[PDB]
A paper describes a structure:
Here, we describe the structure of the whole E217 virion before and after DNA ejection at 3.1 Å and 4.5 Å resolution, respectively, determined using cryogenic electron microscopy (cryo-EM).
We determined cryo-EM reconstructions of the extended and contracted E217 sheath at 3.1 Å resolution (FSC = 0.143). The extended sheath is porous, with visible openings between subunits. The internal lumen is ~75 Å and houses the tail tube (described in the next section). The interface between gp32 subunits is stabilized by 11 hydrogen bonds, many of which form between residues exposed by the extended β-turn. The interior surface of the tube is mildly charged, with two charged patches, one positive, exposed by Arg125/Lys127, and the other negative, formed by Asp27. Before genome ejection, each tail tube subunit contacts one sheath protein generating an extensive interaction surface stabilized by two hydrogen bonds, one salt bridge, and 99 van der Waals contacts. Notably, tail sheath subunits do not contact each other in the extended tail but are solely connected by the association of their C-terminal β-turns and N-/C-terminal arms.
Residue numbers in the entry:
A (entry chain E), B (entry chain C), C (entry chain B), D (entry chain D), E (entry chain A), F (entry chain T): 1 to 144
G (entry chain F): 1 to 504
Amino acid sequence: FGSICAFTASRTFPNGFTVTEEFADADPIDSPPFAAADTGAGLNGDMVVWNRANILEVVVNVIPNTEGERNLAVLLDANRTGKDKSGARDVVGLVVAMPDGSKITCTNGTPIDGVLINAVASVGRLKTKPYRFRFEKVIKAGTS
Amino acid sequence: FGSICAFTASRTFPNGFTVTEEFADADPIDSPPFAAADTGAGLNGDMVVWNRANILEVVVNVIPNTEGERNLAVLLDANRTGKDKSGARDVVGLVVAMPDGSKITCTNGTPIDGVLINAVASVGRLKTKPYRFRFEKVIKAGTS
Amino acid sequence: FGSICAFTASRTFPNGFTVTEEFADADPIDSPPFAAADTGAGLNGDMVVWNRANILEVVVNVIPNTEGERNLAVLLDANRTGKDKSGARDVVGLVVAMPDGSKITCTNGTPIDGVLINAVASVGRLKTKPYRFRFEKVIKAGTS
Amino acid sequence: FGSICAFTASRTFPNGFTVTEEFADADPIDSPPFAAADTGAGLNGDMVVWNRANILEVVVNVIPNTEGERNLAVLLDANRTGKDKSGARDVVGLVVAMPDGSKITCTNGTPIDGVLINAVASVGRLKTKPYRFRFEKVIKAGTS
Amino acid sequence: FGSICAFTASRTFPNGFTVTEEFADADPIDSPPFAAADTGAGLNGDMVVWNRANILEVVVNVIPNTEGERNLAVLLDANRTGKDKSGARDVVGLVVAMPDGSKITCTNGTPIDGVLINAVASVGRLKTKPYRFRFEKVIKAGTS
Amino acid sequence: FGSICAFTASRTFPNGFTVTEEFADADPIDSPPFAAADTGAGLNGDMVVWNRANILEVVVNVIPNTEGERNLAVLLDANRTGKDKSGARDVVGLVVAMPDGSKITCTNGTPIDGVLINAVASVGRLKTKPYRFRFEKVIKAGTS
Amino acid sequence: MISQSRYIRIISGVGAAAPVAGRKLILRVMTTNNVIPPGIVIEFDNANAVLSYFGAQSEEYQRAAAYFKFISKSVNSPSSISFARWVNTAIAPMVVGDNLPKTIADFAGFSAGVLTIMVGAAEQNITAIDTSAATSMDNVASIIQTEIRKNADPQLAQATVTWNQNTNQFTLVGATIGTGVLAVAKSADPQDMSTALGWSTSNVVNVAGQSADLPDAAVAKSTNVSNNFGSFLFAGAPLDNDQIKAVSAWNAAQNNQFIYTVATSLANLGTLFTLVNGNAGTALNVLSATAANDFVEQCPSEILAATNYDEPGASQNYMYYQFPGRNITVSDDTVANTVDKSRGNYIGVTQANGQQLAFYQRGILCGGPTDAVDMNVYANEIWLKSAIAQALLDLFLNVNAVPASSTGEAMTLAVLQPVLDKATANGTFTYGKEISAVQQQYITQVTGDRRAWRQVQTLGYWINITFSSYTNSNTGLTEWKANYTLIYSKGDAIRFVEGSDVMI
C-alpha cells in the first residue's frame, strides 16, 4: 500500500523523480519469470545441465494524467528514435521502497516500451500506460 | 467527452474536415504499444542494448452514417488502388483536442485500413468502421 | 430491415434473381476489413509507404429452404468443378438496395465458397448457408 | 426429425443397411464448407481467378450400441489396415432421405475416420462415434 | 458401472493384475479418433484414395492411492529409462470387460506415458494419474 | 495437509533447510507428465517401439515473505549468471514427506526458474513464487 | 603345477548342441522285446544310445537309424524317440531294476555267510553262496541260480538267472507263469547280495504274473505311464485286421491327440478301408511285397517329429517328401487311382525332363466329414490343444482363486491371448478366407452372436468364454465350471498346376 519508486537518469533526470500513482486494475511492478538453466538427457539416462543467460525485466502501470506519468513520457520521448530529434543515450536506475523496509535497487537499465499518445476506451475513460523496463544488476538490501 | 479530431489532406481536403461521432461500443482513438529498444545478454552476464525504429499508429471508430464517416470513406477511396481509377498521393495530418487543453498533432501520414461497404450484424444493425492510420512525427503541445 | 439483393449472372441467370431471406443469427452481408497500404521505417527514422493491392469480399447467409438459396445453390453447382460436369465460366454482378436509398453495385465477380448439402445441428434444425463472394469494382450511387 | 440414411458397399454390404439413430448432442450429418475458387490481384488492380478442386465430405454421429453403429464398425474394420488382416477395397454409397422429399445421393466414396473401441466419459456414459466419410459425386433429386 | 480391466505383462506380471478404481472427474478408458484413409483430388475432378497406417491408443485414469495404481506405477518404473537401472522389455496385454458382455482384447502393446510422483492440487487434494498406452491388435468378442 | 519438503545443497546449504508454507491458490509440488516411449507403424501394419529419454521435473509455490521462500531465493541467487558475481556450482537434493509415510527422495538436481523481485497484483497483494526444479534419480521408500 | 583346466577348460571334437529349445512331438514304438520291462517307458536322445541298449542286430536299432537320419525341407531332425513294451504272451513274475554299471567283477570277498532275504507270498531265505572264484559274471549268475534251485518253493524250484552284456541288469524269472508276485528286501547282514547285486537298491522294477493282453489295452497302459508322444506305431509282425480296427477305435476315442500309422499290402488295403472307415487319426501306408520292410509307416512320424512349433513357418504340407532309403511302391496311373480311393499313402515314381523323382504321394487321413482329413491340420490341432491346456493349468496353479464372475472370464481370456498370437505366428491360423452361406449359418448357429463370421473372415479366429454351474458324479456337491468356444479357418494349399502354351 505504501509503495514508492524513485527513478534516476544519467542525463535527463540527474537528481531523479518519484512516482506514487500505480493505477487501479492493471498490475503495477510486474516481473516475468526468470530462466536460469537448461538441461538435456542423453541415451542411457545421462543428464547434462548448463546455465542460461538472462536479465531482469520490470513493467509499471500508471495513471494517464499524473506527474510521474509525465516524467516517464518525457524520458521515453528523450530516448526515442525519430525522424529529426536528438537521442540522449542515458542509463536509468530504479529503487523500490516497500512497506516494512525491503529496498530493492536496479543499477543499469534503459526504457523499452511505451505508448506515445493517450487512448480512450469504449466506456469513455483514458487508458493506462505500460512503460516497460529492463535492468542488468539487482541488489537487495531488505534483510530486515 | 468533449473530444474532437480535425483531419487535413494535402490534395483531397486542403482545408480539412472535422469528426465528432466516435461510436458507442468500439474503441475510438486507439493506439498499440510502441517498441523503442531491444536487448541481448552475452555469456558471462554482459548486456548490450540497441534502439529499434517504429512509428506512431492510430485507429478511430465512427458511426456508420455520419458526415465524418463519409469524408473518411471519400479519402480512403481517393487513395485506394483499383482497376481503372486515379490514385491521388496525399499526406494526411491529424490534430486531436482533448478536454482541458492537451492538443496532440501528427504531421505526415497515410491511411492503411478500411471497410469498403456497410455490413449488417446479426442483431440487425449496421456495423462500425475501423479506419486505421499511421503517422511519422508527433508533437505534444498540451503542457497545460 | 428493408434490404434486398439482386444477383445477375452472364450465362446462368442473364435476367437475374432476387434474394430477401437474410436469416436470423448469422451475419448477412458481411465484409472483412480492407488493407490499402503498408509502411516501413528505416534507420534514423525515415518512413516509406507503398500501396497494397486487394479486392472487395462479401458473404451473405440465407435460410436453408428458400428460392434465393436454391438459386444460389444452382449458381454454385453450375460454376463448380467435378468428375464429369460442364463448367460455365460466367461473371456475376450484385446490387444491394438499403433502406433510405444508398444503392451499392459490384460489377465483376465469381462465387468462391458454399456448402454442398444440407446439414442438421444438434438441436434438430437445418444449418445455415455461407455463400461467399468476391468482386472487382464497386461504385456507390447513394449520396442521398 | 424423420431422417434416415441408407449405406451400401460394393463387397461388404452389397444390399445395404439403414441407420436411424442419429444421437443427441453431437451434430449428425455434418458437412464442412466447400471451397470452389481462388483469386489474386496484380499490380495496377488487375484481378485473376482460377478454380480449385475439392470433394464432398460428410460425418454422421450415432448411438454407441445400435445396429447401424455396429454395421458401421464392421465396415470400418473391414476396410482398415492392420498387422495380419485382409483389406477389402470397396466403394460406399450414401442416400439421405429428408422429411418432405429432398433425396440426396452420393456415389463413390470410402470410410476415413472412426473410433476403434468404446470409451466412457467422466459422467459415466458411453461416448459417441464420429464415422467420417468423403464422396466424389453428389446428385440432388429433391426439387419437390 | 461394472467395468474392470485386467492387465498382463510378459515379464513383470506374468499372471496379471486387475484394476477397478477408475477415478472421479477424469475420463477413464479414453481413446482418440482413428484415421484410416486419405484422399486427393486432381485437376478435372478425379479423386484418388489411399490407406493410412495407425494403431490403437488408450489411456486410463486411476485413484492416486490404490492397488491398481501401484501396480501400474511398478510397470512404468520397470520399463522406464534411467541413469543406472535395468530395463525389462515386456509386452503388455489388456482385456476390458463391460456390463452386458462385450469383452475387448488388445494383444501387443507397451506403456507410453505416466507421472513419476504424486502432485497436490490447489484445493489440497492429490492429483490423478494419466497412464497412457498403445496397442497393435484388437479383437472384439462381445458383439452379442 | 501435513506435508513438508527438506532441501539440501552441496555448497550453499550443506545441512539443508525445510519449507512448510506451500501457499494457497497456486499448485504446490506440481509435476508434468513423463513421456517414456514412442511408436511408429510401417506399411502393412507392422509396429515398432523405442524408448525415449526424459527426467523428472518438479515445481513448488511458496508464500512471498517466509523463511523457506528466502532460503529458496538465496539458493537461486548463488547459481545465477550475472555481470560480476561468483557462480557456485552445487547439486541439490529434495526429500518430500507426505502424511501416512510415503517418503520420496530425489538425488541429483539443479534450480532452473524463479522470479528475481517481488511483484504486486492488481488487487494489491504480493504475488507468488514459482521456483521450478529438475532432478535425475527418484527412489520411493513409501511402501507402507 | 595346477592342471590349468581348473581355470580354463576347452573341449574339442564333440560340439554338442543345446538339448531342448522348443516343443516337438516324438514317435512311440510298441515292441515285444524281452529286454524292456513291461511297466516302464524309455526315451533315447541319440541313435548310439539305442545301439548300445538293444544291440546292432535288433530291429529297434534299424528303426532308430532310419528315424534319426532324416532332414526336412527346413534343416531339422527329430532328436528324440521312445519305446514301450507289449506283452504278447503270458509272462512269469520277474525282478529287474539294475542299471548301475556294477559288473566290474567286484563280487569276490562276499562269499562268506550270504543270507539273502526274499519277500514273496511266504518269505524264505538262502544259505551262504560262494562266489570267491568269480571266473566270470555268467559263472556268478550260475552259482546264484543253483542256490536259488536249492529251495523247494514252487517259484524258486525252477527259477532262472540270466545276464545281459550290453546293459547291466541282473534278471530272475519265476518258475510259475501266469500269476505270482516276487520281491526282495535289504537285510542288515554285511555279507548280503542286496547291495552286492542290484536288487532292493534305489529303483527296482517289480512285475507280477500277467496274462497276454490285447494291443488296444496294451497301448492304454503305456499312455497312462506317459503321454509325451505323437504318431505311435506297432513294431514286429503285422497285426490282424480286428486288432488294427480295435486300436483305431481306441485312438478315435481320444479326441485329436495321437496319430496311428499302420503298414498294409495292396491286397489288404481295400479290405482295411471298409473296417477303418471313419475313425479319424489312422494313416494307411502301402507296403512293398517284393523288397525289404523299409519302415514306410515311419514316413509321417518323421515329418511330424521334425517340426518345431515355436519357430515361425512351422506348418507345412506332407505331399512332397523324398526318402532316399525308401523304395518305390506304385508306378502306374490306374494303380494310383485305385489306391487313392482307399485313402492310402505311398511312394510313387515319376520322370520329368529325364529325371526320376520319388516322393510321398499323399497325406490323407481316414475319417468322417467332420474330422480333419489332412495331416497338417491334425498336427496343428494337436499342438493347439496341448498349448491351451498347459496355459490353463498354469493359470490355475499360479493364482489364489478364479472367481465365478466377469473377472474370471477376463483372467482366462488374458491367459489365452499369447497362445493365440503364437498360433497366428506359426501358420496354424490363416486370414482372409472367403466364407460361404452354409459356413456363415453354421457359425451363427454355434455362437449366438451374429457378425462373428465377419471377424473370422477378416482376422481369422473368434473366441468367447462363459461360466456356469454343475454337479459332479463322485459327490453331490455343486461346483462351478467355465466354457469357451474357438472358431478358426483352415488354410488352402496348391497341389496341382495346369497351363497352356500358345504360339502367336
